[PDB]
């Protein structure tokens, strides 16, 4: 598909698509780069995650709009407007599931299995938790518990490695904790675990800031502020 383009050209075009805010193109260029079979560098893993996080973030936001319309349409006293809202929410839902399945597929074939370094392994397992969590946001049927547990299992293995192999200030460790905390709060119905995790993560990072350069400090404090934003919202 992107099979005939050079890996380096795909990478270069992903960067151009990012500059152009063309995230669907960005994601397809990065998908092509992953399918070349070589491991991704730090920079390239970042492009991969930014492309999909934007594509799926757009589909999730639209799904939420449509879901909220569909819920109002189902309230007592609501005029029957036919199947259209549910159909079009399903259409957006299907496309979003397809994007999650695409990313999960890239992680399983074969990014995770070849990722030996903590910074690559934790990154990819965080993505695995994130995309199962997006599937969980829309899941309503037989598989919901297993989708939730898949998100949990991926975040958990990422947390276990990151606690062993990464400093408490590492941005990947902080972003993973941020998202796993959101998973607990809104997917797993465990707001206490979500709060505890955000708090402990924030405090352990505070105590390690002193080891950092000014640039590392700014990187870590950026995501710490997201932890604090959630603690503020939730407490």
């Amino acid at each position: 598909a992107m099979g005939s383009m050079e890996r380096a050209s795909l990478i270069q075009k992903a960067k151009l698509a990012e500059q152009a805010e063309r995230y669907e193109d960005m994601a397809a260029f990065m998908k092509g780069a992953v399918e070349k079979g070589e491991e991704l560098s730090v920079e390239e893993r970042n492009l991969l995650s930014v492309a999909y996080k934007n594509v799926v973030g757009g589909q999730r936001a639209a799904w939420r709009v449509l879901s909220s319309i569909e819920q109002k349409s189902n309230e007592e006293g609501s005029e029957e407007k036919g199947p259209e809202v549910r159909e079009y929410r399903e259409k957006v839902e299907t496309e979003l599931q397809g994007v999650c399945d695409t990313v999960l597929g890239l992680l399983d074939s074969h990014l995770i299995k070849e990722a030996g370094d903590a910074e690559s392994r934790v990154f990819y397992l965080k993505m695995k938790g994130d995309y199962y969590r997006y599937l969980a946001e829309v899941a309503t049927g037989d598989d919901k518990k297993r989708i939730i547990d898949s998100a949990r299992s991926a975040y958990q293995e990422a947390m276990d490695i990151s606690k062993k192999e990464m400093p408490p200030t590492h941005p990947i460790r902080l972003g993973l904790a941020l998202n796993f905390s959101v998973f607990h709060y809104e997917i797993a119905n465990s707001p206490e675990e979500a709060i505890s995790l955000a708090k402990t993560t924030f405090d352990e990072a505070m105590a390690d800031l002193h080891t950092l350069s000014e640039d590392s400090y700014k990187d870590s404090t950026l995501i710490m502020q997201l932890l604090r934003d959630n603690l503020t919202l939730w407490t």
Binding site: V182, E186, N230
Partner: peptide, 6 residues
């Protein structure tokens, strides 16, 4: 507003 993720 909306909780943060990254």
């Amino acid at each position: 507003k909306r909780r943060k993720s990254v």
